[PDB]
C-alpha cells in the first residue's frame, strides 16, 4: 500500500485532464493514469463539494480493500491523502470497463454473462466468508463490477463495504435490498438481493428502474422476471435482452435458470434469500 502525492497522481493523470476520465459520479472522478509505467485508475473523492461523505467512502473504502484480495476483486495499489486538496485511491486499471456499460457479433452471448454471474459470485463469496469478518459490500450492480483485459469480472467500489464484527425506482435504488433502502439494515442477504438485480438486468437488459403502470403501481423488475419464469421458457424468451443472440434451447434454457436464481436472491425476506454459497453451486452446476 504506497502512499502517493498529490503531484504524483497530478503527473499520472496527466493534471486531471478531463480526457483522462474514465467515470463519474456526484462524489468522485476516475481517472486514467500511469505511474514503472503501471496502469492505474485513480479514483479523486470530490472533497470541495461533499467533503463528510467523500471522507466517509474514502476511509471506508481504504480501510476495507487494503485488508481484502481475490482474483475477482478490484485492487488497490495505494492513495493519496492530503486534507483539502486531495483524497484518492490508486487502484488497478481494469482496461474493459464496466459491467454497466458492456449492457448498455456482440460478445455477451449467454454463456459470456453466465460467466460474469460465476464471477461476480466468487467475489462476493469472499467477501462474505473469506476474509475474518463478513464484508457487506452494499453497492453490488453493473457500474461496480469491472472487467480484466481477459474480460473477468471483479467487484470494485467499496466505498459503502460494511465489516461485520416512466421508472419505479430511480438512479441505484432498483438494485437494493428493502430493507437496506428503507432502514439501512445490513446483512450478507442485502448482496445477494442486489445480485438478483444485477443478473435480471444482466439478461434483460433492463435497469432495475421498474415502471409505475397506469394505475399507479409499479412493476418491479422482478415481478417482470417472476411473470415471464412463470410463463415458461417462452415468457422468459419474451424478456430477455433483445441484444443477446438467443438461438439454441441451451441459451435459453441458461438464462431461464439463471432469472430463477436471481428471482431465489431477490426475495422480498432476507430469510428466504439464499447464501452467495449455494447461489455459486447453483450457477456453477448450469457452467457446465
Ligand atoms: N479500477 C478501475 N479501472 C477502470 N475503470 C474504473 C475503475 N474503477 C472505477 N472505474 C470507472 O469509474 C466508475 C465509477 O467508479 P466507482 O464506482 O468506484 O466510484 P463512484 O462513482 O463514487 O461509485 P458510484 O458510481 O457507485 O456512485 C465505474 O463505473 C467505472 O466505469
Ligand atoms: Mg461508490
Known amino acids: 500500500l504506497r502512499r502517493f502525492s498529490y503531484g504524483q497522481l497530478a503527473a499520472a493523470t496527466n493534471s486531471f485532464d478531463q480526457g ?3 467515470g463519474s459520479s456526484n462524489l468522485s472522478t476516475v481517472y486514467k493514469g500511469v505511474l514503472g509505467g503501471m496502469v492505474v485508475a485513480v479514483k479523486r473523492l470530490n472533497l ?17 480493500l487494503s485488508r481484502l484480495r481475490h482474483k475477482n476483486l478490484a485492487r488497490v495499489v495505494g492513495y493519496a491523502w492530503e486534507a483539502g486538496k486531495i483524497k484518492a485511491l490508486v487502484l488497478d486499471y481494469m482496461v474493459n470497463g464496466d459491467l454497466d456499460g458492456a449492457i448498455h457479433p456482440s460478445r455477451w452471448t449467454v454463456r459470456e454473462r453466465l460467466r460474469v454471474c460465476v464471477s461476480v459470485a466468487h467475489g462476493l463469496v469472499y467477501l462474505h466468508s473469506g476474509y475474518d469478518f463478513p464484508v457487506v459490500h452494499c453497492a453490488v450492480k453493473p457500474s461496480n463490477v469491472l472487467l480484466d ?19 419505479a425506482f ?17 446483512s450478507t442477504k442485502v448482496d ?12 434483460t437488459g433492463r435497469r432495475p ?10 412493476l418491479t423488475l ?5 411473470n415471464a419464469v412463470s410463463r ?18 441451451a441459451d435459453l434454457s441458461t438464462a431461464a435458470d439463471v432469472l430463477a436464481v436471481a428471482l431465489s436472491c431477490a426475495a422480498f425476506e432476507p430469510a428466504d434469500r439464499p447464501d452467495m454459497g449455494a447461489v455459486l453451486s447453483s450457477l456453477l452446476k448450469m457452467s457446465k
Open 222 to 226: 422482478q415481478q417482470l422476471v417472476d
Open 48 to 64: 470541495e463539494q461533499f467533503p463528510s461523505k467523500s471522507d466517509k467512502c474514502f476511509l471506508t473504502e481504504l480501510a476495507t
Open 170 to 186: 430511480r438512479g441505484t435504488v432498483g438494485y437494493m435490498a428493502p430493507e437496506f433502502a428503507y432502514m439501512r439494515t445490513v
Open 192 to 203: 445477494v438481493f442486489s445480485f438478483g438485480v444485477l443478473a435480471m438486468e444482466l439478461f
Open 209 to 218: 428502474t421498474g415502471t409505475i403502470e397506469e394505475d399507479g403501481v409499479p
Open 232 to 249: 415458461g421458457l417462452d415468457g422468459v424468451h419474451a424478456v430477455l435482452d433483445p441484444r443477446m443472440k438467443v438461438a439454441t434451447e
Open 149 to 167: 483485459g481477459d474480460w473477468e469480472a471483479r467487484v470494485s467500489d467499496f466505498g459503502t463495504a460494511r465489516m461485520l464484527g416512466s421508472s
Open 20 to 22: 483522462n476520465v474514465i
